[PDB]
Structures are given as C-alpha cells and as structure tokens.
Design a protein around this ligand. Structure first.
Ligand code: WWO
Ligand code: ZN
Length: 257
C-alpha cells in the first residue's frame, strides 16, 4: 500500500508505521553550520575490493543492486562505527527534475539523487536480525548532482531497461561499487532510521560531504523506470524520496573542518 503518491506518500506512512513520527527518523536536513566537529571520529574504512554483486531488482519503489553478504567481502568499518558492517545492497532515490531527489538535504539544498549503500552489523548475524537493533545498520549516503557522467555508474544505467517494472530482476555480476565513491570520504554522522517503511530506528547514518556527478542522460534513465508491474498502467518511478524529518534531540557530528 505505501508508496510515494498523493494518497500513499510519506505523509501517510504513519498510519501503517507509527514509528514515522518517532524520535530518530531519517532523513534530515544537515545544517552545516551547527554540525559539531568531532576530532575523535576516525576515518571511514570502505573495503570494497572483494565485493560480489549478484543481481539488480526493481522492488516497486527503487532498484536495488544486491551483494553476497554471506562472508566479509565488502565491509564498512571505522568512522563512527564499532566492528564490521557488511554491504547487502545499494539503491538510489531520485527526482522528477534535477532540482530534487535527495532525501538528506545540506543547508536545505536538495541534490538530484542520493545513493544509499546499506550495511548490517555482523554481530547480529544477518540483516533481518540487525534491523531490530539500534546499532544494526550503517548506511553510507552519497549525493548525486547533474554534471559530468560518472563512468562507474554506467553499467547500472545500462541494465535498467531489463528491470523496467515492479518485480523484475536481472543477473548483475562483477559490479564494483568503488566506482560510485567520490574522492573524499569526509562525512557527517547521526543516529536515524530506514527512510522507507518499516522506518526502523536501526541506522547509523554516514553522509559524505562530497557529491558525485552524474550526467543528465544517466539520471534520465533512472526516470524511465516504473513503480507499476508489467501487467499495469505506467506510473514513472520518480520522486521516490522521503522529505527531511525533525532532528529532535539529536546532534549531527562532522568528521571535518
Ligand atoms: N532508504 S534506506 O537506506 O534507509 C533503506 C535501507 F536502509 C534498507 F536497509 C533497505 S532493505 O532493508 O529493504 C535491504 C534488504 O535486502 C531499503 N529498501 C529495500 C526494500 C526492498 C523491498 C521493499 C522495500 C524496501 C531502504 F530503502
Ligand atoms: Zn534509501
């Protein structure tokens, strides 16, 4: 039932998922001036050398690229984190227009899209158990602006027409997610939630300061996907983002300046 329209969009979610109005919801606006510099935050460790992508799927809300997370192959550690988080999937949120699309904002600025690389804490043994814990997930968020092409995104853009509608999937092997990373790993971090239902409050958010650039043609291809299944009337998969939620009693910490 939930989705991103007038009748089932983010403002309706609280009726099925009351945690929507909870104490640590995401995304948030990142006010760069009042984010607190913390010189004890460690550099983020992104070890994606042994990553094994498996498959790409249209789940009716976004497309996921899923990875084999049955061993420590692509992990996030360090930064604000304790222990090892294993990469399970990444996906994006994007707009109908280049002027919106991101879930987090920076001094109220929206970006054209936002990448989420979702990782789960290996001390909970799998993703389903991790989401039930306040430190179960670490999500690395990367903003996309429109400008030059991101060559490491093209393999993703080129498969999308094979997963146009809800429920479609395709083999997606040997995709290297290091090709989606900007040069700097400077980040903001705060405790928050999944930004889609069930909206569980289980996420340490790690949001990179530096956006990657993708071309207008790359982001246009995301907008040709469909929220509907093959049987049904075409509804373009656009504006699949949740707006900024109240920061409430939280401080966003910065790894820099
Ligand atoms: N926007 S978010 O980064 O906060 C986020 C997650 F953190 C996340 F873990 C997931 S996941 O739990 O479903 C990964 C499971 O393999 C999704 N969304 C994925 C999804 C898939 C099907 C239906 C709904 C959501 C997701 F959207
Ligand atoms: Zn997301």
């Amino acid at each position: 039932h939930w989705g991103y329209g007038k009748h089932n969009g983010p403002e309706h979610w609280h009726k099925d998922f009351p945690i929507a109005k909870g104490e640590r919801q995401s995304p948030v606006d990142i006010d760069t001036h009042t984010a607190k510099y913390d010189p004890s935050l460690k550099p983020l460790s992104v070890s994606y050398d042994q990553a094994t992508s498996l498959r790409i799927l249209n789940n009716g809300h976004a497309f996921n690229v899923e990875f084999d997370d049955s061993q420590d192959k692509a992990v996030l550690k360090g930064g604000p984190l304790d222990g090892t988080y294993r990469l399970i999937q990444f996906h994006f949120h994007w707009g109908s227009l280049d002027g919106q699309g991101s879930e987090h904002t920076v001094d109220k600025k929206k970006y054209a899209a936002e990448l989420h690389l979702v990782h789960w804490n290996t001390k909970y043994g799998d993703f389903g158990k991790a989401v039930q814990q306040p430190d179960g997930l670490a999500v690395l968020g990367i903003f996309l602006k429109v400008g030059s092409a991101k060559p490491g995104l093209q393999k993703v853009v080129d498969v999308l027409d094979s997963i146009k509608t809800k429920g479609k999937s395709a083999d997606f092997t040997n995709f290297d997610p290091r090709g989606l990373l900007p040069e700097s790993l400077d980040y903001w971090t705060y405790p928050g939630s999944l930004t889609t239902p069930p909206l569980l409050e289980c996420v340490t958010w790690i949001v990179l300061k530096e956006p990657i650039s993708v071309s207008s043609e790359q982001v246009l291809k995301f907008r040709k996907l469909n929220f509907n299944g093959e049987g049904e009337p075409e509804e373009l998969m656009v504006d699949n983002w949740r707006p900024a939620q109240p920061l409430k009693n939280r401080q966003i910490k910065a790894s820099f300046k």
